[PDB]
Design a protein around this ligand. Sequence first.
Ligand SMILES: *[C@@H](C)[C@H]1/C(=C/C2=NC(=C\c3[nH]c(C[C@H]4NC(=O)C(C=C)=C4C)c(C)c3CCC(=O)O)/C(CCC(=O)O)=C2C)NC(=O)[C@@H]1C
Ligand SMILES: C=CC1=C(C)[C@@H](Cc2[nH]c(/C=C3N=C(/C=C4\NC(=O)[C@H](C)[C@H]4CC)C(C)=C\3CCC(=O)O)c(CCC(=O)O)c2C)NC1=O
Ligand SMILES: C=CC1=C(C)[C@@H](Cc2[nH]c(/C=C3N=C(/C=C4\NC(=O)[C@H](C)[C@H]4CC)C(C)=C\3CCC(=O)O)c(CCC(=O)O)c2C)NC1=O
Ligand SMILES: C=CC1=C(C)[C@@H](Cc2[nH]c(/C=C3N=C(/C=C4\NC(=O)[C@H](C)[C@H]4CC)C(C)=C\3CCC(=O)O)c(CCC(=O)O)c2C)NC1=O
Ligand SMILES: C=CC1=C(C)[C@@H](Cc2[nH]c(/C=C3N=C(/C=C4\NC(=O)[C@H](C)[C@H]4CC)C(C)=C\3CCC(=O)O)c(CCC(=O)O)c2C)NC1=O
Ligand SMILES: C=CC1=C(C)[C@@H](Cc2[nH]c(/C=C3N=C(/C=C4\NC(=O)[C@H](C)[C@H]4CC)C(C)=C\3CCC(=O)O)c(CCC(=O)O)c2C)NC1=O
Ligand SMILES: C=CC1=C(C)[C@@H](Cc2[nH]c(/C=C3N=C(/C=C4\NC(=O)[C@H](C)[C@H]4CC)C(C)=C\3CCC(=O)O)c(CCC(=O)O)c2C)NC1=O
Ligand SMILES: CCC1=C(C)/C(=C/C2=NC(=C\c3[nH]c(/C=C4\NC(=O)[C@H](C)[C@H]4CC)c(C)c3CCC(=O)O)/C(CCC(=O)O)=C2C)NC1=O
Ligand SMILES: CCC1=C(C)/C(=C/C2=NC(=C\c3[nH]c(/C=C4\NC(=O)[C@H](C)[C@H]4CC)c(C)c3CCC(=O)O)/C(CCC(=O)O)=C2C)NC1=O
Ligand SMILES: CCC1=C(C)/C(=C/C2=NC(=C\c3[nH]c(/C=C4\NC(=O)[C@H](C)[C@H]4CC)c(C)c3CCC(=O)O)/C(CCC(=O)O)=C2C)NC1=O
Ligand SMILES: CCC1=C(C)/C(=C/C2=NC(=C\c3[nH]c(/C=C4\NC(=O)[C@H](C)[C@H]4CC)c(C)c3CCC(=O)O)/C(CCC(=O)O)=C2C)NC1=O
Ligand SMILES: CCC1=C(C)[C@@H](CC2=N/C(=C\c3[nH]c(C[C@@H]4NC(=O)C(C)=C4CC)c(C)c3CCC(=O)O)C(CCC(=O)O)=C2C)NC1=O
Lengths: 172, 177, 161, 160, 160, 11, 164, 74, 374, 11
Amino acid sequence: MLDAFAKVVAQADARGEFLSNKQLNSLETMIGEGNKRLDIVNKINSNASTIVTNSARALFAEQPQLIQPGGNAYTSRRMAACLRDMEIVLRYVSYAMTAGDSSVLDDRCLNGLRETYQALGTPGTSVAVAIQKMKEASIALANDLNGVPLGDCSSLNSELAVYFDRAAAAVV
Amino acid sequence: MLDAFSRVVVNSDSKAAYVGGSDLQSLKTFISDGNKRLDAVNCIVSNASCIVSDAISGMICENPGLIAPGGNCYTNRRMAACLRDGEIILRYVSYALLAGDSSVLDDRCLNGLKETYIALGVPTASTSRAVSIMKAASTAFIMNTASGRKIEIAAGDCQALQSEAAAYFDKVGSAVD
Amino acid sequence: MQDAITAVINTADVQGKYLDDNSLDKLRGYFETGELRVRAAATIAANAATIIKESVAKALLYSDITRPGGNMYTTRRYAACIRDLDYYLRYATYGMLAGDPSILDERVLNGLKETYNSLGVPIGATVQAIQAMKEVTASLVGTNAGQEMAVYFDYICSGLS
Amino acid sequence: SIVTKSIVNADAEARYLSPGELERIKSFVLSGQRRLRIAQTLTENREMIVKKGGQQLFQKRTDVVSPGGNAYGEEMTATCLRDLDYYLRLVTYGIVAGDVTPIEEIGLVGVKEMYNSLGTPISGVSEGVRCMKDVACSLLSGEDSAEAGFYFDYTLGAMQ
Amino acid sequence: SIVTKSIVNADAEARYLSPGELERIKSFVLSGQRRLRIAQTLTENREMIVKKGGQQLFQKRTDVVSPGGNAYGEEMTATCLRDLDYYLRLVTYGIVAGDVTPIEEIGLVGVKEMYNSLGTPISGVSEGVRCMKDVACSLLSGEDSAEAGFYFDYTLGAMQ
Amino acid sequence: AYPYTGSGYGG
Amino acid sequence: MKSVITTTISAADAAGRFPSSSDLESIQGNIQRASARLEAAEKLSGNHEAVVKEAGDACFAKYSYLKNSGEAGDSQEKINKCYRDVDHYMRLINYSLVVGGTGPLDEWGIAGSREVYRTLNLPGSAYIASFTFTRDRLCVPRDMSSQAGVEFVAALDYVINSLS
Amino acid sequence: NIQFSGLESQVKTGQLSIKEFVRALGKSSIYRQQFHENFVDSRVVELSFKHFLGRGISSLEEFQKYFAILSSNG
Amino acid sequence: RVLDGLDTVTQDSYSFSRYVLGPFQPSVLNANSSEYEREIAIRAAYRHVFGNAYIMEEELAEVEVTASQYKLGNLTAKEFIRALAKSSAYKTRFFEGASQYRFVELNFMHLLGRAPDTQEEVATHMNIYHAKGFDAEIDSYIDSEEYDSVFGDYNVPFLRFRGAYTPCDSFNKQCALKGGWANSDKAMGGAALSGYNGSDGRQMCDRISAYVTSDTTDYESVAGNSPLLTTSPNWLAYPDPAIAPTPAFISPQEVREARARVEKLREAYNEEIAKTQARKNAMAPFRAMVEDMAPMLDRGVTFGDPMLVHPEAKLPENESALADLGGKSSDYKRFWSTMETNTVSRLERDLEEAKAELRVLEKGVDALTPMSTS
Amino acid sequence: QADLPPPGIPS
Ligand SMILES: *[C@@H](C)[C@H]1/C(=C/C2=NC(=C\c3[nH]c(C[C@H]4NC(=O)C(C=C)=C4C)c(C)c3CCC(=O)O)/C(CCC(=O)O)=C2C)NC(=O)[C@@H]1C
Ligand SMILES: C=CC1=C(C)[C@@H](Cc2[nH]c(/C=C3N=C(/C=C4\NC(=O)[C@H](C)[C@H]4CC)C(C)=C\3CCC(=O)O)c(CCC(=O)O)c2C)NC1=O
Ligand SMILES: C=CC1=C(C)[C@@H](Cc2[nH]c(/C=C3N=C(/C=C4\NC(=O)[C@H](C)[C@H]4CC)C(C)=C\3CCC(=O)O)c(CCC(=O)O)c2C)NC1=O
Ligand SMILES: C=CC1=C(C)[C@@H](Cc2[nH]c(/C=C3N=C(/C=C4\NC(=O)[C@H](C)[C@H]4CC)C(C)=C\3CCC(=O)O)c(CCC(=O)O)c2C)NC1=O
Ligand SMILES: C=CC1=C(C)[C@@H](Cc2[nH]c(/C=C3N=C(/C=C4\NC(=O)[C@H](C)[C@H]4CC)C(C)=C\3CCC(=O)O)c(CCC(=O)O)c2C)NC1=O
Ligand SMILES: C=CC1=C(C)[C@@H](Cc2[nH]c(/C=C3N=C(/C=C4\NC(=O)[C@H](C)[C@H]4CC)C(C)=C\3CCC(=O)O)c(CCC(=O)O)c2C)NC1=O
Ligand SMILES: C=CC1=C(C)[C@@H](Cc2[nH]c(/C=C3N=C(/C=C4\NC(=O)[C@H](C)[C@H]4CC)C(C)=C\3CCC(=O)O)c(CCC(=O)O)c2C)NC1=O
Ligand SMILES: CCC1=C(C)/C(=C/C2=NC(=C\c3[nH]c(/C=C4\NC(=O)[C@H](C)[C@H]4CC)c(C)c3CCC(=O)O)/C(CCC(=O)O)=C2C)NC1=O
Ligand SMILES: CCC1=C(C)/C(=C/C2=NC(=C\c3[nH]c(/C=C4\NC(=O)[C@H](C)[C@H]4CC)c(C)c3CCC(=O)O)/C(CCC(=O)O)=C2C)NC1=O
Ligand SMILES: CCC1=C(C)/C(=C/C2=NC(=C\c3[nH]c(/C=C4\NC(=O)[C@H](C)[C@H]4CC)c(C)c3CCC(=O)O)/C(CCC(=O)O)=C2C)NC1=O
Ligand SMILES: CCC1=C(C)/C(=C/C2=NC(=C\c3[nH]c(/C=C4\NC(=O)[C@H](C)[C@H]4CC)c(C)c3CCC(=O)O)/C(CCC(=O)O)=C2C)NC1=O
Ligand SMILES: CCC1=C(C)[C@@H](CC2=N/C(=C\c3[nH]c(C[C@@H]4NC(=O)C(C)=C4CC)c(C)c3CCC(=O)O)C(CCC(=O)O)=C2C)NC1=O
């Protein structure tokens, strides 16, 4: 597993040079961003259960297929598996939001996931709609002006959106 | 007028050599403690009219012969002057807090004070009492321990800086006496 | 009229060239600011009434103008006054959302100075009413979109003056 | 005015004034001093009409002078009675004019847009003018307050 | 609807639909499911929006339910909440239509003439719709209640 | 001092 | 107006030299501290009207005698002037807050204030009541950022210590 | 409650002549929504004469004249 | 009493005058100072005492002994100025080639910082000249009690913006005698032009007529080259204190039009003021009506919370001392938008703009014969 | 490195 820097160091050793002053300035910049990063991850880790639950409500409301007999989310077993999978993807997007690299989220969750949800008959695009709903709820939760000093955080919301867009892109 | 920087430079020119490591190390500590210095001087250039008011008022109340006839705080004019002089003393102490070296305070204000207050007939013990009241009030403001004012600030130990400010006021009070 | 995109196609077209990297940078600039222009126009659409009410209340009322012999005296004049403030707000939103003030040149500021100097409409009171709408509108849409609306209100004020 | 309306009328028909319209001008110029009596009485009794009409307005309608209404406070109440003074002045103009043109163009053309731009309920304005109609009909004769009262009725019909 | 507006547009220009307008139709027909979710939620939460919006209306505006107002009485209050139910229904129609043409032609074209013929303050109606906008924005998401809330904002701009 | 041009009843 | 730029330019002009690296570091510090203060100014221009309400209402909440007699607050019109002068001072706090030195607040508000306020029987204690109310209604976490709040406190401090 | 306030005002100034006022009223969406949408191109032709000239079609060759304009060019 | 006294008696005059804005403030060599502080104060002295005149490094050697003595702190600054003014430098710039009015006038500027008040004073100092030379003139200016009281031993002389000004014309002088920051004394007087090769140039004097007889210096001479202008405080007076530059291609028609406009504006102005007295409190009869029916309208507070109070009932918290009348944000914000709204205010600014334009014409119409008419 | 890496092969 590689962190935000571990990628810089790993490339710098894959060429075997030192870090230039340019690289060190970039790292120092990301550190000064890092408090805002921890704030976003704290907001996500707090309200996560409402993210998963509300997003699943909107999924089954907007697509009434899966709650019906014959649908894929039809059994209490299958529904619990559905919600828990949404909890999985939100957990690893929280991880890759902390790391600054999308490596851990690829390697643990996204890489290979499509082969499974093909192998079960699960419609991938419904999963993609689910992850888009968690992206909407999560970004609209991350832009809350409650309890935090005001400030500009468009770049980190852009990055977080890149992680959820990678999840929806990897299931579909 | 010399800051901490020019103090390092002047010392190293007396030694007549390059600047080197260790002097710069102490000066690096000056820079990293910079923001606390900033916020401290900001705390003393804040309620300072309040400081001079309270200190001279305290000096008259502790020693009621000032306001008595033929005292140096008797006439309204003389009261205006004493307040102005209290203001000026606190002003140059604030300069010495920014500079970090007492060159400014020694050269601009401190040099002619004993002879001047003698040449005016100003009682010096009373002035040193007023400098002491400004000292204690200034250290209480600089430690955020004033009763009427408690402003939240990012927390940290600042004892160094308090002892610095008290060093300058003791330099003034010891200078008038 | 023309938006920022049409202006880019005008310059690139009138040179005969195709789209080079500079023009694509200008289109990227507009397409970055797109969404901000949309929500600003949404908010102004929502609160036009209150912008005109607050701005008339700050700038024009209880003065010589609505006292008799001022220009605003009588109901017909009052309603014409606040009608003109509605046009300035609406066309200022069009100019913001296009990203190019050519609409203000075509359909508002044409002949308007001759109109107001013909009637005896006070120019300075009009300008101060427009600036009152600029402050209130910038308070609603925020900093960035308030800057954008600020350049178009200032464009109309530069048009009249 | 009646003269203005007749001249404009046969001007748009591009003819001289008809004998009928000239009889209308004769009846108007002979009815003059009665009209000037009416507007003389409503002129010299304006403070009773504005005060008493404002009292019947605020007593019937405690909305606007309540806290949170439009006319709450001393300055706002003064402005409210100021407007009732305006509509009384315009009614006197309409009486001496022999036509509602002065009333319509000074007061009524675009009144709804103005008071909607002020946040003022215009039904309260119409209730105020109806109260001044009752006071002004208490100050006049039978046929006299029929005539003047009908000019007030026109203003009520324009507000509603 | 958007389809109706485009067809009428190029119909009066007597041409087929341009590329631009066909892209607009594509964006509309792909945005469908989201719209149907919103109008589904405002459909199945109507009684909370009408009741709670009526409470905030009458608590902000104690004029019309006071004795002497329009909506004084049990029957009149019921009719008032009936009209708020109408505008809630029409907002849902405007959401699924993707255009305010349903809202405009069912509810807005000549609304001021009607409520002026009924004696009803239309500013109270606009305050009622704003109250239902607050409740309906409390029941939805961020971008979601931005969209639906802006449909309510169109209705408020038509009332004012 | 600053008259508003009106043909009839404007001012 | 005393600012960073005007003090270093004026000081270098009095020096008789080109602007050396010291002035360059001064304006470097101006563009460092700039963002924190400007956040303060944006929020002040956000809700200034409620600052006028609470400020003046606390100002007559303390001293009621101004509304009692003919002295300074005889009419509602003089109360309009009361709130008006408060908004002048808040507008000058916005101005000096944007510039970053105490320049416009000094040359526009403080200069010759003492002849005016002494002349027209205006007590300074009511102004100080207003401003101390505004500094008592300030939260570091909430509203403006802590750095912004600090600069707001400093400017309003300078207002009181100018008047008192 | 339909009001066209700037066509009205640009006519009150003489900026638009009254011909151009009838033009801008005739090109508004309320004209087409009222008279074009519910009617055939032949019937749109006829009603455009009633509104814009105040007479019927004089004769058959004039109808074949203006019907080509409507029918080919909206 | 707003103010105690003149420039000398008290310094309230300095506090609310132009003085605070200007770089016309005193400069002091404070204790033990480095070359940066010595060189600053010595140049600020050279700028004031020579009036921005230009001292080459050769001419600095003339002044050098005295400069060194001041760099000590042995000499007080007034004795330094004394040694500056006794230098052959300062004789050559000013005493050698000047008329006596001009010259005496200069030592008021450089020594005292003020323009001479009256002809009688000027003649007094000239009588001191013919008594005991250039040297006792300089001594008389430095040993004056007004000088000592205002400057003290320390402070380099400066232009005193004391708001007292004994004679207004002496103010107009004092701004005219120092022509702003770019100018110098050789420019103001044609010493350089008259003299061959930038030297031996007789100094020209103006305003002699204004010393002798009761005259007034031009608005141009005080408005173009001034400490008023260099210490500009960035004023949004609709009045422009700056002169409009002279437009070319002026015709007499353009000027009869503007004269007629000024007279029409004056008439409208007087009529509107006279009405203004007539306004009284038109609103006052209705105000008195509302004061009369106060028992019906005025209502007492219900003490409660937002919950549990009848609607339109005022809480003691919402006894805002501006909500008690029913004013608004507008009502405190009104007098700032009054320039456009007010009729009288609007007229006054127009009058003044018209007057400035009229003068600018009065310059331009003066040119005769060879003008390209347009 | 936007796409997913081969099996094993931790990115
Ligand atoms: C924190 C130490 C306090 C407290 C803070 C609260 N402030 C509330 C409202 C409020 N605060 C201000 C001042 C603020 N607004 C500005 O624009 C500026 C400066 C430009 C400042 C310093 C205002 C004007 C307002 C009213 C408007 C608003 O609601 O934001 C507030 C809400 C009070 C309530 O609604 O009950 C709180 C809670 N909280 C505390 O526990 C301590 C005492
Ligand atoms: C261990 C966990 C942990 C956290 C979760 C953070 C939480 C946190 N954030 C900030 C501080 C901050 N946090 C943000 C973040 C925000 N910018 C915005 O536009 C959004 C509302 C929001 C991101 C979603 C900003 C802007 C600041 C600085 C606020 C300021 O100085 O005005 C601070 C104060 C110290 C600092 O300035 O860094 C703290 C403790 N810190 C921690 O130690
Ligand atoms: C480490 C990562 C990791 C994952 C990402 C999941 C992926 C995953 N999901 C399921 C299994 C499942 N996943 C779902 C989820 C779905 N329900 C639907 O309606 C939607 C289409 C979809 C949610 C968006 C369901 C319903 C099952 C059970 C399927 C069944 O038994 O029919 C299984 C088989 C084992 C099981 O039954 O739990 C696996 C491996 N598991 C992991 O270990
Ligand atoms: C331009 C103006 C200007 C200032 C006024 C200062 C303000 C300032 N102080 C600190 C930061 C700080 N300020 C203090 C000060 C103290 N804390 C205590 O508990 C004592 C009461 C007090 C003694 C002086 C401390 C302890 C810190 C944090 C430690 C540090 O940063 O060194 C910081 C760091 C950033 C942050 O905290 O967000 C800044 C910018 N700096 C400036 O640039
Ligand atoms: C730069 C630094 C600096 C200072 C520190 C002061 C010091 C100082 N004080 C005075 C002058 C004075 N100082 C005081 C003060 C006093 N009143 C008393 O009752 C107490 C004993 C004492 C205050 C503690 C008084 C009263 C005078 C006027 C004395 C007199 O005129 O009798 C004077 C003479 C000039 C004047 O009258 O102002 C000076 C130089 N001035 C400076 O420029
Ligand atoms: C640029 C900054 C700036 C200010 C801060 C004000 C300050 C100021 N206020 C007044 C003038 C005034 N200011 C007040 C205000 C007061 N009423 C009271 O009951 C309270 C004591 C107090 C409000 C808290 C009043 C009442 C007057 C008029 C005084 C009078 O004419 O009697 C005047 C004289 C000119 C005038 O009449 O307006 C000035 C300069 N003006 C400025 O240009
Ligand atoms: C010995 C007699 C004597 C006088 C009569 C005055 C005359 C005078 N007034 C000013 C200067 C001034 N005078 C005024 C006065 C005015 N403000 C207005 O609104 C009104 C038009 C007018 C009062 C009726 C103002 C405002 C200034 C400052 C002008 C400015 O700096 O813009 C100045 C320039 C120096 C200064 O700034 O003080 C002088 C010489 N001075 C003297 O020495
Ligand atoms: C968008 C395109 C557009 C604009 C903007 C526009 C302006 C416009 N303003 C007009 C009049 C007017 N405009 C005003 C305006 C003002 N009075 C005041 O005191 C205020 C300071 C100021 C407004 C801020 C007034 C009073 C009149 C009426 C003059 C009269 O006819 O009596 C008129 C003459 C027609 C009429 O209203 O009767 C036009 C045509 N016309 C257009 O087609
Ligand atoms: C004849 C030509 C003419 C009319 C009619 C007219 C009306 C008019 N009414 C006004 C305000 C107002 N009008 C009212 C009226 C009312 N408040 C109530 O509660 C009542 C229900 C109602 C009256 C019946 C009030 C309170 C204001 C003041 C709003 C404010 O500025 O604070 C204003 C703003 C100027 C001012 O008074 O401060 C105008 C211009 N103006 C004209 O030139
Ligand atoms: C679909 C479009 C549409 C609308 C909106 C509509 C409204 C409508 N509102 C009515 C009455 C009414 N509407 C109100 C409404 C209100 N009273 C207030 O004070 C408040 C401001 C407001 C409620 C928010 C009241 C009080 C009445 C009855 C008044 C009376 O009968 O005296 C009536 C009279 C008869 C009847 O309701 O059956 C109609 C037809 N009709 C339509 O076809
Ligand atoms: C939008 C609804 C609408 C329609 C359809 C319409 C048709 C229409 N067809 C016409 C003529 C005609 N239409 C035809 C059509 C045909 N001849 C054949 O043999 C074929 C079967 C057929 C073509 C497929 C012919 C030949 C004429 C002219 C006949 C003549 O003038 O002698 C005319 C006579 C004048 C004119 O065209 O301008 C009208 C108005 N008008 C309308 O408003
Ligand atoms: C009756 C005659 C009389 C006085 C006058 C006072 C004067 C006075 N102030 C003190 C000290 C003192 N004074 C202040 C300043 C002051 N307090 C504030 O909170 C604010 C806003 C102030 C200015 C308005 C502070 C902050 C202190 C330090 C003590 C404290 O924490 O309050 C001390 C203690 C001195 C010491 O510690 O040696 C004295 C004697 N005392 C008297 O007996």
